[PDB]
Design a protein around this ligand. Structure first.
Ligand SMILES: C[C@@H](c1ccc(F)cc1)n1nnc2cnc3ccc(-c4ccc5ocnc5c4)cc3c21
Length: 327
């Protein structure tokens, strides 16, 4: 298939509820390939795609050189009733890279620069009265996914090391302005903030919670929330972070999760023993007591503050000691 008389599909990069993203040759322009998002002809996804186009048009006007590392939209059009958005071609997602590495975690120096760029990008959105709402490693993509495969003696396996860890943030179809309607449920479950789970209302801080989850995943290679159930997810939080704040518990209407304004959770049920084996207090996940591991986990703990009003902002996160070896 050849959209818009110039774009020949050569590969499908990824597929989702919205449609797919394909890699295309541009037969009119010089031959650097592009990424093309082809949106399903369903109202739900059409409307998100038009919102994405509006957001990216305004971000391109404010930040035409992508200083703040949002993916660059090159053009958009309609084709057989599908909205098609042409993007600069990026490399693998940060999730794809970890997975293809056998779920080996990223090196701390790479985590530092990736976290910085992520916080920079999302803080730019937040500066602009926008919340992303769907931050996850799948929506953080490497500008170039080239690697060197080195022998790692510890322990005895070949491992892939990023040549350049620069990223960009993608997927603005769920992004929500301060004054716009806020969806009831946002984010992918493992990155979803507690105020979303408890239906208390959400704003920019829910992005910070997701980034905190992303950072631990980069550090560990796996999610600390291996769950597909909301009450179990809350039990995992309490295992990692301590009890939920009482003020959040009495404000929620999610009464099925609570007994006497405490989480209705049997730690000695079968699911309770699953949680106890999969999760543990946050700092027990640290693999070193070195000061820069300590500052990463201090940053993560501040991003995983339960109360969205007390959670660190990305403006404050950007000044965190963890990022010093970058400056
Ligand atoms: C997880 C992600 C994604 C989807 C497909 C894919 F191949 C890679 C990433 N994703 N999930 N939901 C959405 C919505 N809109 C988008 C718009 C663009 C891109 C995007 C942009 C440039 C790319 O360069 C290479 N893959 C890319 C994907 C991804 C998305 C997108």
């Amino acid at each position: 298939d050849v959209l818009s008389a110039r774009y020949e599909i050569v590969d499908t990069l990824g597929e989702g509820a919205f449609g797919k993203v394909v890699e295309c040759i541009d037969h009119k322009a010089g031959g650097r390939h592009v990424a093309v998002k082809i949106v399903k002809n369903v109202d739900r996804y059409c409307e998100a795609a038009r919102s994405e186009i509006q957001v990216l048009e305004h971000l391109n006007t404010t930040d035409p050189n992508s200083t703040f590392r949002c993916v660059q939209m090159l053009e958009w059009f309609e084709h057989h009733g599908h909205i098609c958005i042409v993007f600069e071609l990026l490399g693998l997602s940060t999730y794809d890279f970890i997975k293809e590495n056998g779920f080996l975690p990223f090196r701390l120096d790479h985590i530092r620069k990736m976290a910085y760029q992520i916080c920079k990008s999302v803080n730019f959105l937040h500066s602009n009265k926008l919340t992303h709402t769907d931050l996850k490693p799948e929506n953080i993509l490497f500008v170039q996914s080239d690697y060197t495969e080195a022998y790692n003696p510890k322990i005895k396996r070949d491992e892939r090391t990023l040549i350049n860890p620069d990223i960009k943030v993608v997927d603005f179809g769920s992004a929500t302005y301060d004054d716009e309607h806020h969806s009831t449920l946002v984010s992918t479950r493992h990155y979803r903030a507690p105020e979303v789970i408890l239906a208390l209302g959400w704003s920019q801080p829910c992005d910070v919670w997701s980034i905190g989850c992303i950072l631990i995943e980069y550090y560990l290679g796996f999610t600390v929330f291996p769950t597909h159930d909301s009450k179990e997810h809350l039990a995992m939080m309490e295992r990692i972070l301590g009890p939920l704040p009482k003020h959040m518990i009495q404000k929620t209407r999610k009464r099925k999760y609570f007994h006497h304004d405490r989480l209705d959770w049997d730690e000695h049920s079968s699911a309770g023993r699953y949680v106890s084996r999969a999760c543990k207090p946050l700092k027990e996940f640290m693999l070193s007591q070195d000061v820069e591991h300590e500052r990463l986990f201090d940053l993560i703990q501040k991003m995983l503050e339960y109360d969205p009003a007390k959670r660190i902002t990305l403006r404050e996160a950007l000044k965190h000691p963890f990022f010093d070896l970058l400056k």
